Design a protein around this nucleic acid. Sequence first.
RNA 1: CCUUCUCAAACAUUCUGUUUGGUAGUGAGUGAUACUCUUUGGAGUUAACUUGAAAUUGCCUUAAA
Lengths: 204, 247, 284, 133, 50, 252
Amino acid sequence: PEYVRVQRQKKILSIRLKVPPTIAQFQYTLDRNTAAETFKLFNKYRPETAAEKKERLTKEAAAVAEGKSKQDASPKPYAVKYGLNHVVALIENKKAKLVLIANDVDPIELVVFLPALCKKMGVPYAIVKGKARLGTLVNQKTSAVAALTEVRAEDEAALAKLVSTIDANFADKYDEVKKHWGGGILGNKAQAKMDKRAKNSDSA
Amino acid sequence: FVRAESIVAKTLATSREKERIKRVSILEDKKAKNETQHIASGKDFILKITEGLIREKTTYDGKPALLFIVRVRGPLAVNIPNKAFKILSLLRLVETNTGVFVKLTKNVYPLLKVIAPYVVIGKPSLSSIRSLIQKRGRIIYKGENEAEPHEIVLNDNNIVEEQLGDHGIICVEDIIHEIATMGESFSVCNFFLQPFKLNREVSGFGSLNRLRKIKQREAESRTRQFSNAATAPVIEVDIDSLLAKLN
Amino acid sequence: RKLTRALGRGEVSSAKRLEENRDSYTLDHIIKERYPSFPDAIRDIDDALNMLFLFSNLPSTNQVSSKIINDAQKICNQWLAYVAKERLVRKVFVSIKGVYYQANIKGEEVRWLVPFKFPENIPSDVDFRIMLTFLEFYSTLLHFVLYKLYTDSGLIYPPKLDLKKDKIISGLSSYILESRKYDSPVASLFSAFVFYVSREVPIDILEFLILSCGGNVISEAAMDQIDMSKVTHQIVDRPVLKNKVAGRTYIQPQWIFDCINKGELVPANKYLPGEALPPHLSPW
Amino acid sequence: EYSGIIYVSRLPHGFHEKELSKYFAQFGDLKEVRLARNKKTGNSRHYGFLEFVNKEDAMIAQESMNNYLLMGHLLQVRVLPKGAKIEKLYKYKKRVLVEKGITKPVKQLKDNMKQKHEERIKKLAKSGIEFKW
Amino acid sequence: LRKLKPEGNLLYDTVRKLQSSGKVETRVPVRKGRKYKQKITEKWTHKDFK
Amino acid sequence: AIPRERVIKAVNELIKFTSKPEEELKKDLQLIVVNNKSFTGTSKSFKLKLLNVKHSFYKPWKEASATAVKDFKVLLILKDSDIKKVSEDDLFDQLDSEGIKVDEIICGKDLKTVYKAYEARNAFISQFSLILADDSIVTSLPKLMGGKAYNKVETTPISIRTHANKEFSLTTLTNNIKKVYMNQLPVKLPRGTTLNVHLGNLEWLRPEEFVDNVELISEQLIKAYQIRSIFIKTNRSPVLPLYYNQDVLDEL
RNA sequence: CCUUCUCAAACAUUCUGUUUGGUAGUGAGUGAUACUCUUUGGAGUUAACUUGAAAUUGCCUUAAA
């Protein structure tokens, strides 16, 4: 179907055409082990579901109806930040401790500057594959980003360890992303043709 | 692929289970030697879970009592130690969800303490025993054309007289009476019963069946305990409910 | 598909909320459209009781989940308690395939078979799913039928049961009936009698008949967990019975079957062990 | 030309030599494997060494595990230079205690204590301490 | 009567009755069916790995 | 009984040795070394003996720590389900009359979740100089807090009977913590002949109080373990052979 | 990629008193004062302080696919 061939030719064009370095920094995604560890850590701080939010609302209403210290009886909240504009606002403040970035945002321009702004402000960041995986913990179809402005003291050591692991696995391993433009892969038939030509030109 | 993290967690859980087995065997040897001056506790203990859940504790007192061990999966990371594997092979509790009756005794009580995490324990009702015998009865064969090495279902009452009749045992109702009464030569009936293979609590892997399995694992975590203290009382779940669920 | 999405998203609480917000389809409208003239619904009852008594006896296995077996055993115990309280039994026929039964239902005849309570192999060659659907349809039909039969008699439904009685023998004594002459002769047979039974004889198939006839019943199996001060008879089938009390009558189990098939109360001197019984003298 | 010998560190507890052999064997055959341990205790020192029969397999396994977080430890590995002659790294076990006495006659140690009391008194007097008796 | 040994299977009798009534079709149980090999291929995410 | 005049002369000599002039805080510590043929049966044992004392030795300790950077504090631990019942006010209202106060109460579940990450485990345990714990939880502590806490007597948990009658009679725990603070000097019993009790800083107690405490400790030790010999010393000071019993050697 | 021993007895009724038992730790490093023995072969202990669970080489499977 024409949409299938259209998307396939679009992927083939994205693979064949040369890419500026600011693009193609995506697909240098965090390794599946560190990514699974980051998701196991983020899962503890998923945003509250609407049913739990209504339960907390009824609890605070019952407390105000008889108790004191209105809206203060509840514990401090602890949930991953996920709003794109809210995430960018957390940077350059700077309360953010980490900033995940989906590699597969449909508008590539929306997130191309996020790694550069994070490198400018120094906030740790990584490009996890798949916006849907970031959205599953967010209780939303897609979020394209995730961050942790605060964390429980018991998890602070695991958070620092995950930050150092992400740095060693990405910030140093992919320092060459500034250069070496991607997208240079040739087609299979053209590759075989050039190989046979180079072989015949100087070999039997 | 071994997936190093898995083998590491397995080695750690196995080392913990081995340390617990050593701590239990030390107390067992100290009790067999009657060197009670240093034992952490001077008496056996047992506990009964009941429906946040209600709980109670009572000394075993050494009185014999019927029990129906039921093999259960887990702990997930613990490969079976050879000692626990031998203690289970003595009870013929292979093929998890297998069950077998046992005559509790002071000599047998410590053995349950080592396999306690591996198997739930309780006191089935006599109706539960009648259901377990009438639903999944099976019998070993010998001599007797079409061939001896073949298990046969427990239907013909006459075979119970042809085999167990030297003891005076009669049709399966007599075996049920000998089991509920804990009468003489009850162990021969246990060997002759071909311990029942209870069906797994639910077939599934569907979404609704996955939710059912999640609720079952949650209830199991709420019920089962792994204190590994070597002195915690053995759990005594209401086996009648587990049998009504599995049967 | 919604539950699969809730399970794949990791929000198990949403899956529980979705499972709570649903209800199983009811067949009662099909039971009404398919069987007008409720006695016409009784005309087809024979298949329902047969399929239910069959499914109740088989061991729990995959594709059963045992909940269907429990509902079948419950409906069977309820139908048996109703047949006993109303003394509707009229004929019996033991068979190698099971103990056949017959009883009037507002004057309609209703034959049914009771499988023996023994383990049975599953060939697995049959299409079990169609049997399960037929069992569900027959269960809804027999449930509506028992509800109408209980409302007609004024008995509370579903009948209450003492849980302690279920833990002993789980027999017909469970689900005691109560309100919110007798058929003469088949009803109130063996009146004022208090039978006893040896362990070797079946307790369920025999106690239900003596109870439908109104005679009292006691079993040695009840003594395994726990008076015999009023027993007037003691069924026994052992090859060599232990020394009997001189004042108590003794008879083989078969004597009840011919007495129900005839109702003449044939002399006790017949069917005395070890003497051979008449082959069957079957009603049919 | 890096040797097939490999160094490892920050191993989580329970990552004994059997585990390092079972895991690294999937990458290929290894001529030897060992793990450091305290001489006075069986606990691991959280570092060890390994040797692959094929030098390329050593660097290939090192490329993947160089930053493989595991049990909260940021595992690290660095291929050793040429040779390096993997060393003793004895597989120490928890040494049992063993008594070696008393063997001398009690009168001798009693006289030795009676002499050592006056010796310590003279020694503390040598330090200027005024303690007596 | 205690000597009685049950014979046959009631499930086969109920199936034969349902077939004699005509309410249900009867046939040999079906097995897994596939007229083609269902060719598998490596994912591009793995095929590009070096 | 050991002569009291000899202990008086020994404490006076220790006061002279410490009067010679943060190294002084290390040099001011007092101890009573003691020897035995085989302590604890040769088997390791972290259990501490609660030696009797005629005075509240901990009170001067806290009174000196209040002016010191050491910031003396008393940790408390209870059954994991019991933390919900033990509000801090329930201890505050009862202990303010005596002037003692517990800096914090900690559930045993907290040790496995928030006080892991050994750096934090040492940063938290270091703040307290007198740990306390329930009789049941104390056996699980070494697996949780680790063995570093047991290296120092200040960090080792002390048993407390929260459940004299089962199911959380608070008055038992209250009187138990009171007696543990005012009339007890816990000390470990390690492997080998060597042993010593931590008498605390020499400056705190009056010399007669130190003499009476050393006398009661030597009496209890002779009654219990048949100590082969006894000594007392300032941290840097050579051991003083104030007393010894040759008769114990005959059983060697 | 698991998670740790979270109570047992005796006199005693004291609105909890008393006594007994039960407790093997991440490793490395810096370092002061000493004890026991043991036969110089040196093993067991004894104030003190640093740390990213840091580190260069001491002769049973329906928790599947």
